[PDB]
Design an enzyme around this catalytic site. Structure first.
Site, PDB file in Angstrom:
ATOM      1  N   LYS A   1      33.650  38.018  40.977  1.00 21.04           N
ATOM      2  CA  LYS A   1      34.607  37.127  41.620  1.00 21.04           C
ATOM      3  C   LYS A   1      34.286  36.951  43.095  1.00 21.04           C
ATOM      4  CE  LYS A   1      38.731  38.282  42.946  1.00 21.04           C
ATOM      5  NZ  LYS A   1      38.854  37.590  44.252  1.00 21.04           N
TER       6      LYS A   1
ATOM      7  N   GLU B   1      46.849  41.627  50.140  1.00 25.35           N
ATOM      8  CA  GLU B   1      45.466  42.065  50.038  1.00 25.35           C
ATOM      9  C   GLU B   1      45.389  43.561  50.295  1.00 25.35           C
ATOM     10  OE1 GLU B   1      43.062  40.887  48.759  1.00 25.35           O
ATOM     11  OE2 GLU B   1      41.205  40.778  49.916  1.00 25.35           O
ATOM     12  N   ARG B   2      44.719  44.283  49.404  1.00 23.79           N
ATOM     13  CA  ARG B   2      44.464  45.693  49.652  1.00 23.79           C
ATOM     14  C   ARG B   2      43.618  45.841  50.904  1.00 23.79           C
ATOM     15  NH1 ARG B   2      43.920  46.661  43.348  1.00 23.79           N
ATOM     16  NH2 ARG B   2      44.164  44.406  43.645  1.00 23.79           N
TER      17      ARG B   2
HETATM   18  N1  LIG Z   1      24.509  36.254  40.934  1.00 23.99           N
HETATM   19  C1  LIG Z   1      24.495  37.603  40.814  1.00 23.99           C
HETATM   20  N2  LIG Z   1      23.333  38.291  40.834  1.00 23.99           N
HETATM   21  C2  LIG Z   1      23.289  39.632  40.715  1.00 23.99           C
HETATM   22  N3  LIG Z   1      24.388  40.389  40.570  1.00 23.99           N
HETATM   23  C3  LIG Z   1      25.619  39.834  40.532  1.00 23.99           C
HETATM   24  C4  LIG Z   1      25.745  38.377  40.656  1.00 23.99           C
HETATM   25  N4  LIG Z   1      27.056  38.099  40.588  1.00 23.99           N
HETATM   26  C5  LIG Z   1      27.715  39.276  40.434  1.00 23.99           C
HETATM   27  N5  LIG Z   1      26.855  40.308  40.406  1.00 23.99           N
HETATM   28  C6  LIG Z   1      27.216  41.736  40.248  1.00 23.99           C
HETATM   29  O1  LIG Z   1      28.619  41.887  40.024  1.00 23.99           O
HETATM   30  C7  LIG Z   1      29.093  43.066  40.680  1.00 23.99           C
HETATM   31  C8  LIG Z   1      30.512  42.865  41.203  1.00 23.99           C
HETATM   32  O2  LIG Z   1      30.471  41.992  42.324  1.00 23.99           O
HETATM   33  P1  LIG Z   1      31.784  41.483  43.092  1.00 23.99           P
HETATM   34  O3  LIG Z   1      32.365  40.304  42.363  1.00 23.99           O
HETATM   35  O4  LIG Z   1      31.400  41.352  44.543  1.00 23.99           O
HETATM   36  O5  LIG Z   1      32.851  42.676  42.962  1.00 23.99           O
HETATM   37  P2  LIG Z   1      34.304  42.378  42.337  1.00 23.99           P
HETATM   38  O6  LIG Z   1      34.013  41.779  40.986  1.00 23.99           O
HETATM   39  O7  LIG Z   1      34.974  43.730  42.298  1.00 23.99           O
HETATM   40  O8  LIG Z   1      34.926  41.413  43.310  1.00 23.99           O
HETATM   41  C9  LIG Z   1      28.098  43.384  41.787  1.00 23.99           C
HETATM   42  O9  LIG Z   1      27.720  44.762  41.752  1.00 23.99           O
HETATM   43  C10 LIG Z   1      26.897  42.507  41.515  1.00 23.99           C
HETATM   44  O10 LIG Z   1      25.730  43.312  41.331  1.00 23.99           O
END
Ligand SMILES: Nc1ncnc2c1ncn2[C@@H]1O[C@H](COP(=O)(O)OP(=O)(O)O)[C@@H](O)[C@H]1O
Ligand SMILES: Nc1ncnc2c1ncn2[C@@H]1O[C@H](COP(=O)(O)OP(=O)(O)OP(=O)(O)O)[C@@H](O)[C@H]1O
Ligand SMILES: Nc1ncnc2c1ncn2[C@@H]1O[C@H](COP(=O)(O)OP(=O)(O)OP(=O)(O)O)[C@@H](O)[C@H]1O
Ligand SMILES: [Mg+2]
Ligand SMILES: [Mg+2]
Lengths: 53, 467, 477, 508
Positions: B154, B180-181
């Protein structure tokens, strides 16, 4: 006979699982309605008691 | 004008103005406070008394403290100097980088554009992402719901959208974090700094953050969405461009509204939400539109309580959404990124009258083939791959190639994929998927489509890996 | 200060001002606040007056001066409103100038009694094959359109409105229908796009649009249906025909629930007050069909309801089903599958319009309904025939968008379908055949369709010529 | 209308000019008293949440300041308070003592010793209602908070400065998770590494005194009181004390956080603080909401849990981990307070009763448990083994339905079932027997490389034990290498391979 029976059991179980899935969908909808109704009912009871002092 | 605090019940403060009453929604500053405390008026109880919801902790207030009437609702600093600056609901910076210097101030309680300040024609916002632009195009000036929201991408998707929109159309963006946390807020600040959408040195930022912390009283988490809307409305009206507005989370917006309504002493509605739920949501969601000057495209992260889609909160928000994106844990497992569920994603403008006949036909064909592959996967699991026909193994191959091609490398994820980010225009996406559906690339390997830009990159990858 | 014709706002807040004064203010009378808003005086109490503000309470302040207008809540009505958009109080919001109307009608006026009315005897053409053949709607009827999120209800309403142009462009004053579209708690973007769509179809010259969009205070969404119904009652009582489309009547119920809860009234079932049934029956009882001693005018009503997850046995859906003269159940499963309009002909009925249906459509649609009913029960030889014919008909009733059909084309297409001419055509090509056949008959054989329309029946010679046309075209396809 | 100060006594006083000999600025006269709520007339210069003191030696917190009167909540039985009493300002918001002088002491919600070990040192005081840190002071969670439980440290890692949540039903093991976490920190506190020591705070809201006494005995037995504070707000305590005790604990922990040290605070149980606040709010005639809880009950827990931070080196680097405990009723994580606190925190350790009796104790239900911090709060060796363990367990959970049939299925499903059963039998743990990280990684490494695919599942719990004792006795150099180094070096990997094979080579 054993080949045909195993085929028929596979088909019957697939159909039974499909029917259970439809029933689960309907019951989940009913459960959500009932949960919301229960929340509203308890809350209205509290409100009426509070305003009836 | 000066009044006195007469009562303090929790986060509700009753003030008394002997001279003249401030209108509803005004902001009042409590004098004699170590840190700025602002009270928003909400009622006129009579006898010159007003009832106000506090935007900060009311502890340590005394019955009699002087309260100064600002004269206008909460006014925040809006302009190009808010980009890259975190600031709370009342506009005070909270990133400790000094004051937000601007020559403009905007009141956060504004009205939706009149019926004549409204675009009468639909549009499409090209984000440069294959899956979003094909199976669920984002209408310009339309709310987009975003589901999932747990370790599925996300934040990376939000950041990529910010970057693409600030690179393709050149518009800036706002990220209003409703409830927001603080841990995740700091983490997001640092992720933005790393990827580059915020620049602390050269002042070339592309996003203005507005955080309503999760430990602020209910009267503050309920208004941060309005502060974000104000910051974005400046860019729409004054700068005359298309803005993005990320609201994370919208369920927390409804929750804060509900808590404020309960505190003021109002009878709850159906499931214990405020009696003003529909209007509380509508007053905000009606300012995210396409005026004749610019436009604001909003992206609400949405949480569905009890996994119930008919709960009043999502039942009321879904009335406003103009599209939907569904990040799925089941697709990040496959290594596909962005992990957008191609079939569960929805859009209102996926209509041949809006997106054109060719775009509509390509999208419908891709959806149909993906559904066919999904159905065939059961047969593969049960009866084994051998059972397939030759007009079904071909569809399986084509659907796998399409799934691979829907993945893309992001520019804000070059430290996760080793590739270089691609911003695929729309025509490239439509042509690539049209060609794949036609069968023009049935001779290539599936992995030649994984994590590439336009179709020509798939051709080059096939050449490079086969030779 | 005159404490009889003027008062001072004691307490604003919640959108219910308490005023002190107005000693001579009638109940349900409209008062005007100093700022510029207007309100309605519900609660004539001994010591104050409870005025609900038709606007944003931010503009009102304790101390403001309320002045009674002297008349019960009423709205401007007349021909002057056609082609204009107006808020819930009749003030234009399209910026095309002042409305300029001579007559004002009360929004709380009572519905006609039992003697004025008369059975529904004229058809209200919607240009939607499914609606016109299987659930016909007469003039003066109240046909609920009940569905879900994004299942195509506003599409039914707008197809009806756009279709009325065949009659509103002709000369017969007894067939012209003046449409009204009330938008309640609905995105303003949608209302603007809808108004543009109507203007592009030359369908505004006889259409009023009343707006109470989601950014409008609850009292305006509560009062918009009544303003629209008065604007339509004007035509009803003047011997003309009208068609009002409340959209939705569930947003109005939500607004009224807000209004009631903020007034501290005893919530009932789903927190809705006890007046919701009265709220809607007071409104839908005005869609009457006057008898010739009262003018002979009519006012159709097409209320729209959005069920939640397909729940038709909810509280508000059941109220409006107990108020209205039928149903058009739009099913989300069908809509997503590909059937559009997604009318679930199994559960959709028309209490009254069955007798108003046109004879030419009546005879063909009778056998269509029997065939579809038989197909519904079997989903060897006869079974295979029923499945084939039912699938042909179901694919025949699919329709485009914003492309309503005249009754003659519907008759021709359904006649081709039900008489078994398509029983050999592959089920997928039925839509292509339909679109080609319509163009064929609309190009060359205008005499046949015109004769069917004028005579109002499929005469035996018309039957024979239509048989020839369809068989020859099917040969050349 | 009517006011509560319009009683004829006040009006009588004011008519004959007797209201000038009474100081209505710093003193007040109780108008009403009942169910622990007093309504006081006067105290015109009293601040919200200030502490007033009644004539009979009791204390109270002034919560509702209305135009007519002040609503004080009494800190004890309202038997001693009578209408007409005299209430004096104290002048200061409620605060509690803090410092290392509390360690090993049982205190109540207000910092008074209740263990009869003598006065409390108390060099410094701290206000319980202090705003949490901001966006900037914090930095991402990186260090691990070693729970000593194989499941929690392997599949639900907890960092330092994180807010986990031990959510479960009644009698599932929540307090056991908390106590094992508290007891496992002795291996760090005893040692000399000053950045690994964790000081523990145990807030006991609404538990009976016998439970807390047994808990203190358990900690003393494990010699884990010399670095533990216990803040008791037991059932007999007045509602305001149960409401404050989490905040007293949080401030006693914020002291350690502000001074570069690291603290662990275990609000057990938060669902009882919510009930106490609900009582106080309902008796103060505040507008109720869902389930009769006040409107600002999300605020109550958010402003408490958002004080668990990981300050940056420019502020000291200290941290305050929080482990709130919540008791769901049937399984309802969609109730009001469970929902609030699930949306506030950073993860959850979801405990079961189906798993508790199936033999899987601790009953941590993985799949429902989560840690949004994740691998960032794990050591390199634990990462290496836990990635594979988590992947294999996830594979096993989607074919666990077949576990009954098992046979008459492909070989891949048989292997998945076998590996999953071995891994689940591995995650089983005793009680009050935490394990160092090297022990956990050795055991899980043995498990996830197939070296137990031959042993019968019933024998895995005996293998684990015997193998662990073996490595702990014979091979200390390898364990020390893994511990200090933090990772599994290739030579260490080979040593683990040979050790596991040699011990498994003959086990019988
Ligand atoms: N385009 C992408 N390429 C590589 N990894 C991705 C990509 N999109 C998401 N990820 C992976 O998804 C994981 C979660 O990312 P993030 O969305 O920033 O955290 P959250 O989902 O908790 O907000 C990351 O560790 C990342 O490696
Ligand atoms: N006859 C039709 N053929 C093809 N598509 C249709 C048809 N009718 C409706 N749609 C599609 O359904 C979508 C929603 O239609 P419509 O607005 O009529 O539903 P609605 O119930 O009014 O939606 P909402 O409940 O959100 O107001 C439109 O974007 C349109 O593309
Ligand atoms: N891993 C374990 N192995 C063996 N026994 C255990 C384990 N965990 C908990 N128990 C036992 O289960 C019982 C209940 O555990 P505990 O009291 O810690 O759960 P709880 O949820 O805190 O109970 P409550 O919430 O009702 O206070 C205790 O007697 C404890 O000894
Ligand atoms: Mg609609
Ligand atoms: Mg316990």
């Amino acid at each position: 006979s054993t080949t045909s029976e195993q085929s028929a059991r596979m088909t019957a179980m697939d159909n039974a699982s499909k029917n259970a899935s439809e029933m689960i969908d309907k019951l989940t909808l009913t459960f959500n309605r009932t949960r919301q109704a229960v929340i509203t009912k308890e809350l209205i009871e509290i409100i009426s008691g509070a305003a009836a002092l | 004008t000066t009044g006195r605090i007469v009562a303090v019940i929790g986060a509700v403060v009753d003030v008394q103005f002997d001279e003249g009453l401030p209108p509803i929604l005004n902001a009042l500053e409590v004098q004699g406070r170590e840190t700025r405390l602002v009270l928003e008026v909400a009622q006129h109880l009579g006898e010159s008394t007003v009832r106000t919801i506090a935007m900060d902790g009311t502890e340590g207030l005394v019955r009699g403290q002087k309260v100064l009437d600002s004269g206008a609702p909460i006014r925040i600093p809006v302009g190009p100097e808010t980009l890259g600056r975190i600031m709370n609901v009342i506009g005070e910076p909270i990133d400790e980088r000094g004051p937000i210097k601007t020559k403009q101030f905007a009141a956060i309680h504004a009205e939706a554009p009149e019926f004549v300040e409204m675009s009468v024609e639909q549009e499409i916002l090209v984000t440069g992402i294959k899956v979003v632009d094909l199976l669920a195009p984002y209408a310009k000036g339309g709310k987009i719901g975003l589901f999932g929201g747990a370790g599925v991408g996300k934040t990376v998707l939000i950041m990529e959208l910010i970057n693409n929109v600030a690179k393709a159309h050149g518009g800036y963006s706002v990220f209003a974090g409703v409830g927001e946390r603080t841990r995740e807020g700091n983490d997001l600040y640092h992720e933005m700094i790393e990827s580059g959408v915020i620049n602390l040195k050269d002042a070339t930022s592309k996003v203005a953050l507005v955080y309503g912390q999760m430990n602020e009283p209910p009267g503050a988490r309920a208004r941060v969405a309005l502060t974000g809307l104000t910051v974005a409305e400046y860019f729409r009206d004054q700068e005359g461009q298309d803005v993005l507005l990320f609201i994370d989370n919208i369920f927390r917006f409804t929750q804060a509204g509900s808590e404020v309504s309960a505190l003021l002493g109002r009878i709850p509605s159906a499931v214990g939400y405020q009696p003003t739920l529909a209007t509380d949501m509508g007053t905000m969601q009606e300012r995210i539109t396409t005026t004749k000057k610019g436009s604001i495209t909003s992206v609400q992260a949405i949480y569905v309580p009890a996994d119930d889609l008919t709960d009043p909160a999502p039942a009321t928000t879904f009335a406003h959404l103009d599209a939907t994106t569904v990040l799925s844990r089941a697709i990040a497992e496959l290594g596909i990124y962005p992990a957008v569920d191609p079939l569960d994603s929805t859009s209102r403008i996926m209509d041949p009258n809006i997106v054109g006949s060719e775009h509509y036909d390509v999208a419908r064909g891709v959806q149909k083939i993906l559904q066919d592959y999904k159905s065939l996967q059961d047969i593969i699991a049960i009866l084994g791959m051998d059972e397939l026909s030759e007009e079904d193994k071909l569809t399986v191959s084509r659907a796998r190639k399409i799934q691979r091609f829907l993945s893309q490398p992001f520019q804000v994820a070059e430290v996760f994929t080793g590739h270089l980010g691609k911003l695929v225009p729309l025509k490239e996406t439509i042509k690539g998927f049209q060609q794949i559906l036609a069968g023009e690339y049935d001779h290539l390997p599936e992995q030649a489509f994984y994590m590439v830009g336009p179709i020509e990159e798939a051709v080059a990858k096939a050449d490079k890996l086969a030779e | 200060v005159d404490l009889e014709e003027t008062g001072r706002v004691l307490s604003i807040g919640d959108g219910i001002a308490r005023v002190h004064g107005l000693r001579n203010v009638q109940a349900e009378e409209m008062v005007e606040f100093s700022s510029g808003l207007k309100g309605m005086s519900l609660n004539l109490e001994p010591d104050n007056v409870g005025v609900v503000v038709f606007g944003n309470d931010k503009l009102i302040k304790e101390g403001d001066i309320v002045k009674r207008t002297g008349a019960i809540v009423d709205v401007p009505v007349g021909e002057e409103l056609l082609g204009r958009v107006v808020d819930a109080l009749g003030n234009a919001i399209d910026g095309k100038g002042p409305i300029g109307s001579k007559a004002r009608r009360r929004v709380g006026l009572k519905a006609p009694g039992i003697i004025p009315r008369i059975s529904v005897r004229e058809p209200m053409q919607t240009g939607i094959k499914a609606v016109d053949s299987l659930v016909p709607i007469g003039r003066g009827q109240r046909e609920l359109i009940i569905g879900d999120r994004q299942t195509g209800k506003t599409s039914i309403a707008i197809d009806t409105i756009i279709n009325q142009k065949r009659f509103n462009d002709g000369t017969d004053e007894k067939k012209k229908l003046y449409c009204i579209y009330v938008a309640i708690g609905q995105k303003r973007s949608t209302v603007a796009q809808l108004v543009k769509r109507l203007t592009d179809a030359d369908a505004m010259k006889y259409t009023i649009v009343v707006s109470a969009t989601a950014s409008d205070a609850a009292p305006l969404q509560y009062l918009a249906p009544y303003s629209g119904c008065s604007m339509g009652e004007y035509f009803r009582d003047n011997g003309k025909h009208a068609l009002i489309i409340y959209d939705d009547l569930s947003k109005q119920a939500v607004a009224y629930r807000q209004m009631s809860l903020l007034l501290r009234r005893p919530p009932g079932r789903e927190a809705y007050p006890g007046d919701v049934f009265y709220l809607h029956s007071r409104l839908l009882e005005r869609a009457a069909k006057m008898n010739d001693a009262f003018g002979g005018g009519s006012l159709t009503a097409l209320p729209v309801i959005e069920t939640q997850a397909g729940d038709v046995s909810a509280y508000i859906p059941t109220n409006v089903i107990s108020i209205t003269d039928g149903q058009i159940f739009l099913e989300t499963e069908l809509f997503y599958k590909g059937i559009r309009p997604a009318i679930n002909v199994g559960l959709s009925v028309s209490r009254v319009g069955s007798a108003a249906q046109t004879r030419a459509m009546k005879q063909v649609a009778g056998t269509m309904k029997l065939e579809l009913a038989q197909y519904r029960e079997v989903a060897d030889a006869a079974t295979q025939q029923l499945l084939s014919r039912g699938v042909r008909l179901t694919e025949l009733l699919k329709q485009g968008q914003y492309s309503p059909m005249a009754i003659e084309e519907q008759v021709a297409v359904i006649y081709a379908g039900v008489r078994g001419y398509l029983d050999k055509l592959e089920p997928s090509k039925i839509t292509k055949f339909e679109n080609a056949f319509l163009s064929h008959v609309i190009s060359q054989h205008q005499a046949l369709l015109s004769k069917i329309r004028t005579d109002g029946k499929i005469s035996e010679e018309s039957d024979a010529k239509l048989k020839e046309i369809v068989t020859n075209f099917l040969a050349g396809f």
